[PDB]
């Protein structure tokens, strides 16, 4: 879109409707006349537009109003209500902007933020923007969390996030306008290479790929159209669904073959009965012929009975000869039909070993996107964010993704090397007990009004608990935390001294020998200016490869590389790096996925803040003290970076509203 509708699009909003949120903040408007609604909408879209058209500076209300046109600049309180609503939930003046109105002289309320991953940083920048006292507690010795960038000399490579899944409606667009990011397009073409080092033929490539997509679509059809969603009492996973679809394909193939061969049989039997007929016929014709000759022997003159006998046998014989010639025609026809059938046999098989191997590679690609064995994905829901895709081509950050968290942490109070060990939230406030990660006896206590918890769902999943919650999280939130899924996925950075791959190829594959090992080093990326190749490990393999030393792993790597490129072409890597996210105790995994039995609903549960019981009994139910943000909390965009950032913005809005009060709802 373009114009103000463009802005409403870019901000993930319907230009012609009031969202549920806007309904809540402005219930006078929606319940009122359509005209006014339209006014409102335009005001929203136009502001949006303004900020978007220049997100390097703060967009003040004065500025907004100044650039508004009649009649839309008449009801100034409406303009103000809007401007504030937007500023609040960080649809504007979010990220890194030169502040027009310098920060408030004296702060208000105190918020402790666990983790300075992206969600963390984002919220914190907002809360600070709104004038609170924010402080962040990072276990690590660096920011970003699951946004991690390796750098040594000019070698630079993301072990964390790496891709910008499209700019259409991506907040990260804005951020990129704000932050110097070297974004680069991803050339979608991806050659495959079987285990041997032989490229896979385009025929094979496309046929397999297509059958794959068709399989997927099949599962979907199974799911929604057939309500195939509970085999046993267990829910069904994408894995099992695919397996069934496939088995039905093989079965169908066998059915085809059988029908065909049976046609051939039936025809053969027709031929048999035909032949029998023809043979008995020839016998009768032989005997007749004999008799006719014997009757011809009787030389004239002859009485008429005799003449009748010759004429008779001659007639009969010519008859049977006729009949036999017909039968021979019929035999001709049956025979050529049998050649036809025997010439057009249905497909021999459904999938060959090479086929199934390549298919397995496509599945490995799927398991990689979701960072989990397809045996675990929920058949029904695994693709539920699909309806919120950003548009545009997916990109990579040439100068390391970390450039963003770092940029976000400017001006923030961050405490590195601080592992939080306990969260204590009460009617009257919260205290958070943390230790110094270097010297784990050195203890810290932080007291505050509210605690924003951007702890990786893995860390929350931990048993026994990495972080203790006092009082315990309630059964509903824990259960949500148990039901959801957290996946695993790892990368191997290879730093050589010169490029021996195809510099016009951004990514290429390696087809796994088996099904089990399909994730095992199945894919490579050249995205960087430097001679750096990136190997991926996903699926089942990603969890097992963590129990194997670096050297072995880079071994298998260089092995496959040699097999594809040749032994006298693959130098030793000057530098080598291997991620183990499922091991990292500040992560415990890669990102989340919708495990079978889970749904989006649980993402919403994860977002719901906690309200502590009353101190004095018979006291009014308090303010909510405990807030969650982070990638695992945002139903419509999980497991991403934009996802995080949004959750952060969201909670910051929520928190602010709670403690500083929302003046825009009247």
């Amino acid at each position: 879109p373009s114009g103000v509708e463009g802005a409403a699009f870019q901000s993930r909003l319907p230009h012609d409707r009031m969202t549920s949120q806007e309904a809540a903040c402005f219930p006078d408007i929606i319940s009122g006349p359509q005209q006014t609604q339209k006014v409102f909408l335009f005001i929203r879209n136009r502001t949006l537009q303004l900020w978007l058209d220049n997100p390097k500076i703060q967009l003040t209300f004065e500025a907004t109003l100044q650039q508004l046109e009649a009649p839309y600049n008449s009801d100034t309180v409406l303009v103000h209500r809007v401007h504030s609503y937007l500023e609040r939930h960080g649809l504007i003046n979010f990220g890194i902007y030169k502040r027009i109105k310098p920060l408030p002289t004296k702060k208000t309320g105190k918020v402790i933020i666990i983790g300075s991953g992206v969600s963390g940083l984002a919220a914190a920048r907002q809360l600070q923007s709104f004038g609170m006292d924010v402080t962040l507690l990072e276990a690590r010795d660096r920011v970003g969390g699951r946004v991690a960038t390796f750098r040594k000399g000019n070698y630079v490579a993301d072990l964390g996030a790496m891709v910008v899944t499209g700019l259409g409606g991506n907040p990260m667009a804005v951020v990129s306008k704000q932050v110097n990011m070297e974004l680069a397009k991803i050339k979608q073409k991806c050659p495959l290479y079987e285990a041997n080092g032989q490229a896979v033929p385009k025929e094979k490539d496309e046929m397999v790929e297509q059958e794959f997509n068709r399989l997927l679509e099949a599962t979907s059809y199974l799911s929604h159209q057939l309500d195939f969603n509970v085999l046993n009492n267990k829910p069904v996973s994408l894995g099992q669904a695919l397996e069934v679809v496939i088995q039905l394909q093989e079965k169908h193939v066998k059915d085809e073959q059988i029908e065909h061969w049976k046609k051939i049989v039936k025809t053969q039997e027709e031929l048999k009965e035909l032949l029998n007929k023809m043979v008995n016929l020839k016998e009768k014709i032989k005997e007749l012929h004999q008799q006719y000759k014997e009757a011809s022997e009787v030389k004239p003159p002859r009485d008429i009975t005799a003449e009748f006998l010759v004429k008779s046998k001659h007639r009969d014989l010519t008859a049977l000869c006729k009949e036999y010639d017909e039968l021979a025609e019929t035999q001709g026809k049956l025979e050529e039909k049998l050649q036809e059938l025997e010439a057009n046999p249905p497909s021999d098989v459904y999938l060959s070993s090479r086929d199934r191997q390549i298919l397995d590679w496509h599945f490995a690609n799927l398991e990689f996107a979701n960072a989990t064995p397809l045996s675990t994905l929920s058949l029904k829901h695994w693709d539920q964010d699909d309806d919120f895709e950003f548009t545009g081509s997916h990109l990579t950050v040439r100068n390391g993704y970390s450039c963003v968290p770092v940029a976000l942490a400017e001006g923030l109070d961050i405490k590195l090397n601080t592992a939080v060990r306990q969260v204590r939230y009460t009617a009257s406030g919260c205290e958070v007990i943390a230790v110094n990660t270097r010297s784990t006896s050195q203890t810290f206590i932080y007291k505050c009004d509210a605690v924003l918890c951007t702890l990786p769902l893995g860390v929350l999943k931990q048993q026994p608990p990495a972080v203790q919650f006092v009082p315990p999280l309630p059964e509903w939130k824990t259960s949500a935390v148990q039901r959801m899924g957290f996946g695993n996925l790892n990368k191997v950075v290879l730093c050589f001294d010169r490029v021996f791959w195809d510099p016009s190829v951004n990514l290429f594959g390696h087809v796994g020998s088996t099904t089990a090992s399909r994730g095992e080093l199945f894919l490579f990326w050249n995205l960087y200016k430097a001679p750096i190749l990136l190997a991926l490990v996903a699926g089942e393999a990603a969890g097992i490869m963590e129990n194997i030393s670096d050297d072995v792993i880079v071994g298998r790597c260089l092995a496959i590389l040699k097999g594809i490129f040749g032994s006298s072409a693959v130098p030793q890597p000057k530098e080598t790096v291997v991620s183990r996210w499922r091991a990292d105790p500040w992560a415990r995994g890669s990102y989340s996925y919708v495990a079978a039995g889970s749904s989006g609903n649980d993402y919403d549960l994860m977002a719901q803040p906690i309200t502590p019981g009353p101190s004095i009994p018979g006291a009014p139910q308090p303010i909510p003290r405990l807030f969650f943000a982070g990638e695992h909390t945002i139903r419509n965009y999980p497991a991403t970076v934009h996802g995080a950032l949004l959750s952060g913005l969201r909670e910051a809005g929520r928190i602010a509203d709670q403690f500083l009060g929302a003046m825009y709802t009247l």
Binding site: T165, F212, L216, A369, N370, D385, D386
Partner: peptide
């Protein structure tokens, strides 16, 4: 592609 656009979550 498919799903799927290109490299999304699904």
């Amino acid at each position: 592609x498919x799903x799927x656009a290109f490299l999304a979550a699904x």
